[PDB]
Each structure stands twice: as structure tokens, then as C-alpha cells.
Design a protein around this ligand. Structure first.
Ligand SMILES: O=C(NCc1ccc2c(c1)[C@H]1C[C@@H](N2)[C@H](O)CO1)N[C@H](C(=O)N1CCCN1c1ccccc1Br)c1ccccc1
Length: 164
């Protein structure tokens, strides 16, 4: 089966709700497993406590840099980086879950949730899941962003984990 995971997100201490994500282990098992483990923190590090450091309305909300907290860092459960698994899943619309990178084969822990169809990223960013529930939460996060990516409130993953 495919993992169901969750992120509980707050803005300046105040809760915004939960985002439930399906991880497509059936298509990208290595990428799904990385994200899953980072949600439970079972390796001793993960997304808990880290921020949505970059939010661009009508594009995406980006998170996952739990080492540098500014978009330069993050790491995977396999090491500092791992290859692009495949590009089978596409950026088809809002709610798509996909990996940030710094060029080919530089996946770590940073990721983003699309708020529109970002199909110009097809073949360059590995899509590995989608929002099952809580798109309204994602819209709340989005509303605190700006075209520059800076947020007007600190958007934090207070908790995360696995539902099944
Ligand atoms: O934020 C990053 N890169 C930082 C990063 C990402 C991953 C890792 C590391 C560092 C570290 C640690 C580990 N992994 C490896 O060791 C490598 O070094 N990349 C942007 C991006 O991916 N997207 C997707 C959603 C936002 N974004 C985006 C795309 C197109 C247009 C505008 C934007 Br805005 C970008 C920005 C601009 C162009 C291309 C990519």
C-alpha cells in the first residue's frame, strides 16, 4: 500500500490545520520512503519543527530545509543527496507533491506542494504524491506568502507523522 502521512502547520504559533499526503510508493518507492521516514522522524531527524520558508501564491509552497532553514540545506535518509528516481508522475494541478532540487540528482529533503498546475517542471522535479485532505490548509499557507517567496508569518510544521 501507499503511505498516508500528515503535516500539522501553524502560523506564528496559531494552528492552520492538517495536510494529509498520499506518497506514491507504487511509482517512486525510494522517494516516497524518504519523505515518509522524514515525517516520522524515525532516523533521528526530519521535518518536525522546520518551516515553509518559501511560499509563492499561484505557484507552490516549499518546505523541508530542517538543517539550514533558508533553502540551502536539508538532507535525505540515504545521505546528503540521492538521484532522481523517475519522472513518471507529472505536475498536473494543485495539491501535487514534488521534490525541490539544485539540478539533476540533488534530491534531499526539501519539497513543495503546488497550488496550480506547474507542468513546466515536468521532467526536472520528481513528483511523488498528492494532497489527500487539507488543500484548504495549503491555501491558508499560500495566503501568507508573496511573489518574492517571503512569508508574512513564520509557517512551521509543528508536527508530522504517518497515518497508515
Ligand atoms: O529551492 C531550490 N533549491 C534549493 C535546494 C533544494 C534541494 C536540495 C538542496 C538545495 C541542497 C541539499 C540537497 N537538496 C542537495 O544536497 C542539494 O543541495 N530550488 C528551486 C526549486 O526546486 N523549486 C521547486 C519549487 C520552487 N522552485 C522553483 C522552480 C522553478 C522556478 C522557480 C522556483 Br522558486 C528552484 C528555483 C528556481 C529554479 C529552479 C529550482
Amino acid at each position: 500500500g501507499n503511505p498516508l502521512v500528515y503535516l500539522d502547520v501553524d502560523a506564528n504559533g496559531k494552528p492552520l490545520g492538517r495536510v494529509v499526503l498520499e506518497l506514491k510508493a507504487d511509482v517512486v518507492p525510494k522517494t516516497a520512503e524518504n519523505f515518509r521516514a522524514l515525517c516520522t522522524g524515525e532516523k533521528g531527524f526530519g521535518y518536525k519543527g522546520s518551516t515553509f520558508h518559501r511560499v509563492i501564491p499561484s505557484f507552490m509552497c516549499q518546505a523541508g530545509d530542517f538543517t539550514n532553514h533558508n533553502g540551502t540545506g536539508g538532507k535525505s535518509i540515504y545521505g546528503s543527496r540521492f538521484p532522481d528516481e523517475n519522472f513518471t508522475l507529472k505536475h498536473v494541478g494543485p495539491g501535487v507533491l514534488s521534490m525541490a532540487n539544485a539540478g539533476p540528482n540533488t534530491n534531499g529533503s526539501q519539497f513543495f506542494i503546488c497550488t496550480i498546475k506547474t507542468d513546466w517542471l515536468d521532467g526536472k522535479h520528481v513528483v511523488f504524491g498528492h494532497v489527500i485532505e487539507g488543500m484548504d490548509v495549503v491555501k491558508k499557507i499560500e495566503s501568507f506568502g508573496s511573489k518574492s517567496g517571503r512569508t508574512s508569518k513564520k509557517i512551521v510544521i509543528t508536527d508530522c507523522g504517518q497515518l497508515s
